[PDB]
Amino acid sequence: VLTPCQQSEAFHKREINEVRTLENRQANYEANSPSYLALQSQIDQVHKRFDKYGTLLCGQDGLPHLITDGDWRHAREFTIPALLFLYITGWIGWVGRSYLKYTKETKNPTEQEIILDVPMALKYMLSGFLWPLSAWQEYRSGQLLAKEDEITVSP
Amino acid sequence: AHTVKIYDNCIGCTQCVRACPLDVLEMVPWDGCKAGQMASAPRTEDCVGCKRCETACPTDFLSIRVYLGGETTRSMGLAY
Amino acid sequence: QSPALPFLSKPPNLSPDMPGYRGFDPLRFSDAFDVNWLQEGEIKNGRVAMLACLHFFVTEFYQFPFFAGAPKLAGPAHDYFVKSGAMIQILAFIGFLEFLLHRGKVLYSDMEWKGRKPGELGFNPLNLPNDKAMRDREVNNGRLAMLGFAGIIHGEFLNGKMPFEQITNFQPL
Amino acid sequence: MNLKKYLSTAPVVATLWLFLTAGILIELNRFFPDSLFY
Amino acid sequence: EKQVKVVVDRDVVPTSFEKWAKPGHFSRSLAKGPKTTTWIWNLHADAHDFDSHTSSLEEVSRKIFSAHFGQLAIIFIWLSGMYFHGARFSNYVAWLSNPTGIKPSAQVVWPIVGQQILNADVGGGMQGIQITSGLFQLWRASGIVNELQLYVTALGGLGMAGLMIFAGWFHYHKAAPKLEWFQNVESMLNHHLAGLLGLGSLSWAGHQIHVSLPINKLLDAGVAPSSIPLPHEFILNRNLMAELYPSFQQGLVPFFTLNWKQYSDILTFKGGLSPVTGGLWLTDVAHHHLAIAVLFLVAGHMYRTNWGIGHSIKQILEAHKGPLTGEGHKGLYEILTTSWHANLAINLAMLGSLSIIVAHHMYAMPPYPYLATDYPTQLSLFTHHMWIGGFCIVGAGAHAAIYMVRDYSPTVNFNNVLDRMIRHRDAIISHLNWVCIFLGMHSFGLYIHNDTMRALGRAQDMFSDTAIQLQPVFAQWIQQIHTLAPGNTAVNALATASYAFGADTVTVGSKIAMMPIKLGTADFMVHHIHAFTIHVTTLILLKGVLYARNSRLIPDKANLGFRFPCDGPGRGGTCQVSAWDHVFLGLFWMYNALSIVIFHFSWKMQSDVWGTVTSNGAISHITGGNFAQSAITINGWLRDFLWAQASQVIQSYGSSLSAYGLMFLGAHFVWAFSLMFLFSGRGYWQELIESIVWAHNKLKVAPAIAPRALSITQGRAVGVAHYLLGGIATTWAFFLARIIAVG
Amino acid sequence: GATMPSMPFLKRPSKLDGSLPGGEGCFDPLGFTEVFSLEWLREAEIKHCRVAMLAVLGVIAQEFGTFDFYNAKSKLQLSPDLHNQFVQNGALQQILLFVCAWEFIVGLPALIESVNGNREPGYFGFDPLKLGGTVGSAQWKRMQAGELRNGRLAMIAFGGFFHQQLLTKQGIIEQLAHF
Numbered sequence A: 001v002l003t004p005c006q007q008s009e010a011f012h013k014r015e016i017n018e019v020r021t022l023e024n025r026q027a028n029y030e031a032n033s034p035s036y037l038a039l040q041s042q043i044d045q046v047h048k049r050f051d052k053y054g055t056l057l058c059g060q061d062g063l064p065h066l067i068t069d070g071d072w073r074h075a076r077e078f079t080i081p082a083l084l085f086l087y088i089t090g091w092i093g094w095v096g097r098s099y100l101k102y103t104k105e106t107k108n109p110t111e112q113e114i115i116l117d118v119p120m121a122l123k124y125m126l127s128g129f130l131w132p133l134s135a136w137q138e139y140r141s142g143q144l145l146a147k148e149d150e151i152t153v154s155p
Numbered sequence B: 001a002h003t004v005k006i007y008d009n010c011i012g013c014t015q016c017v018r019a020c021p022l023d024v025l026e027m028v029p030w031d032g033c034k035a036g037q038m039a040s041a042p043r044t045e046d047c048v049g050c051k052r053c054e055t056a057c058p059t060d061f062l063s064i065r066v067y068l069g070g071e072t073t074r075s076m077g078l079a080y
Numbered sequence C: 001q002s003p004a005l006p007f008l009s010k011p012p013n014l015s016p017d018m019p020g021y022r023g024f025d026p027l028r029f030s031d032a033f034d035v036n037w038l039q040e041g042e043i044k045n046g047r048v049a050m051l052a053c054l055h056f057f058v059t060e061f062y063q064f065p066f067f068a069g070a071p072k073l074a075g076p077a078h079d080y081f082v083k084s085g086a087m088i089q090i091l092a093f094i095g096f097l098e099f100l101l102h103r104g105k106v107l108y109s110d111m112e113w114k115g116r117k118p119g120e121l122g123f124n125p126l127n128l129p130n131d132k133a134m135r136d137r138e139v140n141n142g143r144l145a146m147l148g149f150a151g152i153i154h155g156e157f158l159n160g161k162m163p164f165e166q167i168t169n170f171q172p173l
Numbered sequence D: 001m002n003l004k005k006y007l008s009t010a011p012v013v014a015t016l017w018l019f020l021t022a023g024i025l026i027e028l029n030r031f032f033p034d035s036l037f038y
Numbered sequence E: 001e002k003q004v005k006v007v008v009d010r011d012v013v014p015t016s017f018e019k020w021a022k023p024g025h026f027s028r029s030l031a032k033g034p035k036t037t038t039w040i041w042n043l044h045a046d047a048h049d050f051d052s053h054t055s056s057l058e059e060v061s062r063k064i065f066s067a068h069f070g071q072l073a074i075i076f077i078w079l080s081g082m083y084f085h086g087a088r089f090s091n092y093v094a095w096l097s098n099p100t101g102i103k104p105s106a107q108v109v110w111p112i113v114g115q116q117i118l119n120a121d122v123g124g125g126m127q128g129i130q131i132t133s134g135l136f137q138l139w140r141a142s143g144i145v146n147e148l149q150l151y152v153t154a155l156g157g158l159g160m161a162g163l164m165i166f167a168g169w170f171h172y173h174k175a176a177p178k179l180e181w182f183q184n185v186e187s188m189l190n191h192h193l194a195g196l197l198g199l200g201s202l203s204w205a206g207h208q209i210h211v212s213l214p215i216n217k218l219l220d221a222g223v224a225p226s227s228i229p230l231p232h233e234f235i236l237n238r239n240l241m242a243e244l245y246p247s248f249q250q251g252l253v254p255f256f257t258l259n260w261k262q263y264s265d266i267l268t269f270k271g272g273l274s275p276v277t278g279g280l281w282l283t284d285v286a287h288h289h290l291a292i293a294v295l296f297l298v299a300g301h302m303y304r305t306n307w308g309i310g311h312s313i314k315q316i317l318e319a320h321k322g323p324l325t326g327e328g329h330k331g332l333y334e335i336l337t338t339s340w341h342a343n344l345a346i347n348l349a350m351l352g353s354l355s356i357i358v359a360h361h362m363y364a365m366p367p368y369p370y371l372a373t374d375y376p377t378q379l380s381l382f383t384h385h386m387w388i389g390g391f392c393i394v395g396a397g398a399h400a401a402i403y404m405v406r407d408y409s410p411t412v413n414f415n416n417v418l419d420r421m422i423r424h425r426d427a428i429i430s431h432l433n434w435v436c437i438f439l440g441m442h443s444f445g446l447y448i449h450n451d452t453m454r455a456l457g458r459a460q461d462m463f464s465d466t467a468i469q470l471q472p473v474f475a476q477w478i479q480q481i482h483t484l485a486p487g488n489t490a491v492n493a494l495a496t497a498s499y500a501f502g503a504d505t506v507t508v509g510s511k512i513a514m515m516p517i518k519l520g521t522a523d524f525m526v527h528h529i530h531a532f533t534i535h536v537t538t539l540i541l542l543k544g545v546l547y548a549r550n551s552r553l554i555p556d557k558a559n560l561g562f563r564f565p566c567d568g569p570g571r572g573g574t575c576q577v578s579a580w581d582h583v584f585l586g587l588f589w590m591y592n593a594l595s596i597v598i599f600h601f602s603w604k605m606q607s608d609v610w611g612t613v614t615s616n617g618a619i620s621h622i623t624g625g626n627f628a629q630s631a632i633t634i635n636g637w638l639r640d641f642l643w644a645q646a647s648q649v650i651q652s653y654g655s656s657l658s659a660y661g662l663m664f665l666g667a668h669f670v671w672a673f674s675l676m677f678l679f680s681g682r683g684y685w686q687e688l689i690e691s692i693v694w695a696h697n698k699l700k701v702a703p704a705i706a707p708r709a710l711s712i713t714q715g716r717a718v719g720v721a722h723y724l725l726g727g728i729a730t731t732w733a734f735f736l737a738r739i740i741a742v743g
Numbered sequence F: 001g002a003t004m005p006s007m008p009f010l011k012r013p014s015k016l017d018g019s020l021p022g023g024e025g026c027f028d029p030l031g032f033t034e035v036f037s038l039e040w041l042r043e044a045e046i047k048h049c050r051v052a053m054l055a056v057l058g059v060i061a062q063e064f065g066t067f068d069f070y071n072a073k074s075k076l077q078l079s080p081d082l083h084n085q086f087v088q089n090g091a092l093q094q095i096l097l098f099v100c101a102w103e104f105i106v107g108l109p110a111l112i113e114s115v116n117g118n119r120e121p122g123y124f125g126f127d128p129l130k131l132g133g134t135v136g137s138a139q140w141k142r143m144q145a146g147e148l149r150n151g152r153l154a155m156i157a158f159g160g161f162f163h164q165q166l167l168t169k170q171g172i173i174e175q176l177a178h179f
């Protein structure tokens, strides 16, 4: 079973354990001196991190468990980062494909591939901010998928 | 006892004969190319299978194919 | 050779005919980037910054009773209106107007200035003069507002006071 | 003396781009540490 | 008589970036465009191979002189970095105040992703990563007391790097020497023997006498580092040096009057380690540098250069001839003056052997102060120099094979030692292979036999102290002779060179510095294992060098080249037949031998030398005498050493050593990834790449540079590189974590 | 005696440099122009001359007035304490910001242009008041030489100012008035 970390004793126990681990090393140093301030910042960050993670769900071990079933209540856990990742990598892939398609139109595409043409490379990188829309219309026009490619014996 | 076979796509460039280290290949008159010559393997008993000829062939797909079959003293390259 | 900098040469891509030409481009951004796209970027950056500047100036004196008292600060107001849902509606009608003014050539690889000049996106309801004098005045006021908006928002970041509220009895840091 | 072309070669451009990407990631991680579940 | 003159060409090569935009310009084949992804790998593989670029020896010599300057500049930048880290991000002053309590550290990790935990509580106020490079001990031995000196040294290093940058560019674009230069081996040897080494040791001896000696004497006398006079004060005010060393009262007069015995206050030969710091007496070290400087200077006047006096290396080489060697060393002079690969092979073998000797001598006779008490530093330095030495040795073999395949000449090598060896290479390799088999059986079989006996409960039939005993009587005898040397064969020596041979133990800061390393049956077996592994690796390298040109399997290996994949699936199979492949195999064997060597040093040191000493002299080692009965079985080597000592690297999580643990896992991954490239062939990867390329073609996203699999030779190189990287990194993390957590 | 060609040293063979504004001295005893570009060295020398003249006049001017709104707890202008305090209060941090902006945005392009053989070293075309007259004519080459000499003197005087202040712990005017 899973329960919110804010209501799980294991989460608070872990927070106290980490704070104690930092305080043990912090006691050796002096209040105002090199170090000791370095450990106080860590303690504050620990408090903020646990307060932030309290909204997540965790079992008996107290470790935040992420629900990827697609439930809207857990969209921020996997749905939103998943969509943002797909957007970033689709942008990377689409700009790369367009740059390759442009280089193939040059006299020596190999030289362009080795020595990248920063002007055109940046021209295609800046664009593509609407790659999901550019992927379509390329597919509809038939300019995305090919027809005949290299195939060996016994196709 | 490797089997070396020459196919009709041979262009008679002689690179296979020049790259063969056992005098297994040679050039014979032919009329299938302007060079008027074709590669032949009349001494396949001395072949070892190094495939230097296959590497030296310029045709798209090697016009000379060496198939490793029966193994003998000559094919194993044993000086002892 | 450049008018702005007589010790460096004028960039080969820039030209005197386009509005605002001062030959000021030491880093040679005109090279490696389309002159027309860079010019369009300058025009829109200036227009958007000009409108933003007027927002900060007229926001001191609130005039929208429907939204009532607002934070009046850049960050706080943006966050407030983003959580209130009005910013999601503001993002809309802008992208639509971008797709409408550009006629679908929103991308940098799509935008082509065929029969137009950088910045000539229709929008001439009064049919007033568009000669190079008016275009140069437009780009100059756009640059002045591009600098002014940045200064105003930075002042709001450090002081938290509004532009005209900060100009009076000026306080040092 | 075409230094721009050399700077545009695959190793130089790749190292510069990856350096910028790593810098952006690191800067985001110190300004917004321990980011999880957006 | 040949004039040893300098002739150079001005503005031989223009300085421009035009060639920077054309990768592969140095090669005719690589300058035609990639056409495939293999060109990218070939570009780097043949980048430093100056002999393949041009056929002129002059150009290669210039490309080497330069790039040597570049590497010197790189070394100077690295040294400047070490000094700057010590001056800015290290607890050097605090360490000086309490060398035994403060842990050396010169690295501060930024707080970004929780990595701030790596900043261990090394003490001295600052918290960082503990450094085991011995930089702190070296700086202390050099007289450094304040961080201002460290900053000045870093700045000087940066300046020296800039000079080595300018020199490298100037000797290739402004003044490139001709081939006549670089072929003056007599002059180069005279200068390197009397100027680079002789004068260098002389200058270092002077620095020690005027800086290291007084500063260290005051430091060991309880004087605070801030209260010690500056190094320049000891030179300006002679009264201070006289007070610390009365010999200075006489000045340089005794030196010029041959009354060298008056320098008994600064030029001593005590022989032992200092009981205060645990290291060698700085006076003995200064006297040693003075003697080595005088000896090297005298040796630097042997060869003939621009004057009648001297010797000719060619004449000496040709003079050595005997009945069993027809022409003796005839033709070797021309070989070492017309082929940089031969010189590189000899120099790499000697440099590697020198590094290994350095490791042994540095651990046995700790030269720097407080070096012995810092076991982490001792383990890291011995292991580090041992590894660099082994790598240089394998490289020596590789370059010997390269010379044999490319620069060999039958006319030059006619009836000489090299030709006579190539003639009977079969006797050499078969007899050496027989020796390897005998060594492996009588070394590993003893271990296997002990495993079988212990498992059967028949402990009375083992090769141990209690059961059948194999005592290194010869080594033990040499140790006893060394123990008695300070009074019967070293009259002026006051103590044994190393306490590892005998004498008494030395303790510094409640820690053992150096105590007699008794040898038993376990040491007998491990030493034989070392000899066995060295024999097999040298057999592999020698076989590759002797058959590099030809063999009974491939009569013309030389024409195929030094680095070629194979001759094909003929003659039964000719895979890994080239000399390059022999070097590839020798790398794994050298790694195995070196790994076993470092394992023996680590375990033996932690079980019989390194440890703590309680009041009244009671000694307690890290692993109390377990090596005596646990190092005689493979099970003991896996339980008492690999399993027992690994607990520190696996439990390091949650502490400052967590990084090591992480590196312990990462290394494993790499070592396991290498298997991919070692148990596979490029035919399969090429087919997989064909399918992936078809997938790309279906989307019009195929690249112009045709994707190709790694070459057969490149695949072998990648596999060996990953294997060595993973193994050395795993043993590196294990050694460092184990020695830092305990001891 | 001497060699075939001469130098103002009167015992040296003239180097590549001939007769440049303020370069009539041909003071290159150690080969610096034989390996390094002359334009690069000229640009560096003029930049040094300008920054040093400003520094000398600035050190003297700072000892009279501190504006009264800057703490200036130390009356020594070339002391590390004053440098650190002004860096902390942000004054020198802002000078660094704008000076670096000038060097990257304009200084680097200027040096690249002069290294290619287009822009004369140290020529930024800054002549608000027609003091130098037409470029490359009377009142310009002489004025350029005067600038070079004044800058070299200012560089040597800045080194002297710093060393004297660090050794006497007294200001320039204070030291001039007493011992």
Ligand code: CLA
Residues within 6 Å of the ligand: A122, A125, A126, A127, C029, C033, C037, C038, C039, C040, C041, C042, C045, C108
């Ligand atoms: C902080 C002041 C500032 C400055 C100096 C700029 C400068 C610029 N802006 Mg920007 N802008 C600003 C504030 C600013 N902006 C703010 C606050 C907003 C939100 C209201 C915008 C919204 C905005 C939009 C929507 C766009 C610009 C664009 C541009 C570029 C126009 C020039 C051009 O057309 O060719 C380009 C000249 C270049 C030198 C290329 C820029 C260099 C790289 C390739 C950019 C992105 C790399 C980066 C690592 C990607 C990560 C994500 C990114 C959002 C940070 C120019 C470099 C346009 C643009 O980027 O062109 C496509 C455009 O799309 N601006």
Ligand code: CLA
Residues within 6 Å of the ligand: E202, E203, E205, E206, E207, E209, E234, E235, E236, E237, E238, E241, E247, E248, E249, E250, E251, E252, E253, E255, E263, E266, E267, E290
């Ligand atoms: C390359 C290595 C190196 C270098 C660079 C130096 C450099 C230096 N050494 Mg040195 N030294 C070295 C190695 C080195 N040493 C070695 C290997 C030894 C043997 C262990 C010594 C032993 C040594 C001693 C004992 C002394 C120096 C001293 C010095 C400094 C001055 C030398 C001098 O001219 O005084 C010359 C001194 C003379 C006595 C000249 C001899 C002939 C005179 C003219 C006799 C005539 C009588 C006359 C009235 C003088 C009375 C002198 C009498 C009272 C002593 C100098 C910076 C001296 C120093 O400055 O101490 C800090 C010093 O006393 N060195």
Ligand code: CLA
Residues within 6 Å of the ligand: A092, A093, A094, A095, A096, A097, A099, A100, A116, A121, A122, A124, A125, E691, E692, E693, E695, E696, E699, E701
């Ligand atoms: C233009 C860049 C590009 C694009 C658009 C694609 C696109 C694609 N690849 Mg591919 N790939 C690339 C580069 C690219 N790849 C490179 C450089 C390599 C060598 C490491 C590979 C190796 C590779 C393999 C082994 C496989 C694919 C596969 C695929 C397909 C499925 C998704 C995937 O598994 O990706 C995987 C992506 C990677 C493994 C690494 C990508 C490398 C970098 C991070 C991205 C490329 C950056 C590029 C330099 C940007 C140029 C920008 C330009 C403006 C200058 C997909 C159509 C799969 C397939 O066969 O289809 C089903 C597959 O198995 N790719």
Ligand code: CLA
Residues within 6 Å of the ligand: D019, D020, D021, D022, D023, D024, D027
């Ligand atoms: C490459 C990507 C990258 C990016 C996107 C950023 C972005 C940012 N950095 Mg940063 N930085 C980077 C790399 C990067 N940095 C690197 C590689 C270093 C060196 C390790 C630093 C060191 C650094 C420091 C010390 C600080 C920042 C700060 C900042 C923020 C200040 C605001 C700003 O817009 O300035 C934009 C900045 C950049 C685009 C990067 C310029 C970095 C230059 C070289 C300055 C660093 C000087 C360094 C101390 C000494 C010489 C470095 C040498 C490389 C020349 C910011 C958003 C400041 C901050 O924390 O904000 C409160 C700040 O104090 N950065």
Ligand code: CLA
Residues within 6 Å of the ligand: E064, E065, E068, E069, E072, E182, E184, E185, E187, E188, E191, E192, E194, E195, E196
């Ligand atoms: C006493 C004179 C002398 C000295 C001290 C050296 C010293 C050195 N030589 Mg060298 N050499 C000499 C004479 C000398 N040489 C002569 C006469 C010849 C012609 C016969 C050669 C030909 C030669 C070759 C072909 C090579 C060397 C190399 C080296 C370096 C070996 C690398 C090393 O061990 O790192 C130790 C480094 C140091 C200890 C730092 C010290 C560096 C300083 C600057 C001392 C060197 C002075 C230099 C020789 C002469 C100054 C010239 C002047 C006009 C500035 C080393 C610095 C190798 C090298 O690395 O190339 C650069 C190499 O390839 N030498």
Ligand code: CLA
Residues within 6 Å of the ligand: E044, E045, E046, E047, E048, E049, E050, E348, E391, E392, E393, E394, E395, E396, E398, E402, E562, E563, E580, E583, E721, E725
């Ligand atoms: C003073 C030492 C020295 C010097 C001057 C040389 C010089 C040379 N070697 Mg040699 N070698 C050496 C030592 C040396 N070697 C050692 C110690 C070994 C044993 C490892 C070898 C084994 C060796 C072989 C087998 C071969 C050479 C070859 C060559 C020649 C061409 C090198 C080249 O272009 O490859 C380019 C270099 C690279 C592409 C770099 C490879 C990087 C490896 C994997 C090292 C990675 C180290 C790093 C710490 C990894 C961790 C970081 C990582 C995470 C990024 C060249 C003249 C080749 C030759 O003669 O041509 C036919 C040849 O085949 N060397």
Ligand code: CLA
Residues within 6 Å of the ligand: E669, E670, E671, E672, E673, E674, E675, E676, E677, E678, E679, E680, E684, E688
């Ligand atoms: C640790 C051992 C190891 C590892 C990690 C792998 C990993 C892999 N094998 Mg494999 N293999 C191994 C041993 C190993 N093998 C052995 C012993 C054999 C017997 C010979 C095989 C034989 C074999 C075959 C026949 C095939 C594979 C295939 C694959 C790939 C499968 C697809 C995949 O999961 O991609 C995911 C990628 C990874 C798991 C690698 C991790 C990502 C890396 C670390 C990121 C990039 C580097 C990173 C930036 C750090 C370096 C920075 C730099 C500065 C140094 C994969 C990369 C198949 C394949 O090609 O797939 C398409 C394939 O057909 N292997």
Ligand SMILES: CCCCCCCCCCCCCCCC(=O)OC[C@H](COP(=O)(O)OC[C@@H](O)CO)OC(=O)CCCCCCCCCCCCCCC
Residues within 6 Å of the ligand: E320, E321, E322, E323, E324, E325, E328, E329
């Ligand atoms: C027998 C006394 C030496 C004790 C053995 C250990 C000696 C260490 C030197 C190694 C070489 C062996 C000495 C004989 C070698 C020796 O010096 O012979 C003498 C002879 C040298 O005399 P020359 O008349 O040729 O002299 C002219 C030239 O040397 C010019 O300098 O060397 C050879 O020609 C044969 C070389 C090896 C012959 C094959 C033997 C290989 C066995 C290697 C193992 C040695 C024993 C291992 C230890 C148990």
Ligand SMILES: CC1=C(/C=C/C(C)=C/C=C/C(C)=C/C=C\C=C(C)/C=C/C=C(C)/C=C/C2=C(C)C[C@H](O)CC2(C)C)C(C)(C)C[C@H](O)C1
Residues within 6 Å of the ligand: C050, C051, C053, C054, C123, C124, C125, C126, C127, C128, C141, C142, C144, C145, C147, C148, C149, C151, C152, C155, C162, C163, C164, C166, C167
């Ligand atoms: C396009 C066109 C039209 C024109 C339409 C528009 C929208 C015209 C222009 C509108 C706006 C909102 C602004 C135009 C220019 C804005 C400028 C120049 C703002 C500059 C801001 C500055 C200089 C900031 C100054 C400070 C700074 C930086 C710090 C503050 O602490 C205090 C303060 C001193 C105030 C109409 C007339 C509608 C119809 C038809 O003719 C088509």
Ligand SMILES: CC(C)[C@H](C)/C=C/[C@H](C)[C@H]1CC[C@@H]2C3=CC=C4C[C@@H](O)CC[C@]4(C)[C@@H]3CC[C@@]21C
Residues within 6 Å of the ligand: E010, F030, F031, F032, F034, F035
């Ligand atoms: C860096 C400084 C300190 C040192 C003195 C520099 C010396 C430079 C390199 C110059 C000065 C005089 C020498 C010089 C004399 C004449 C020239 C002409 C010119 O074609 C450059 C080379 C050349 C042939 C050489 C180069 C080498 C020297 C030594």
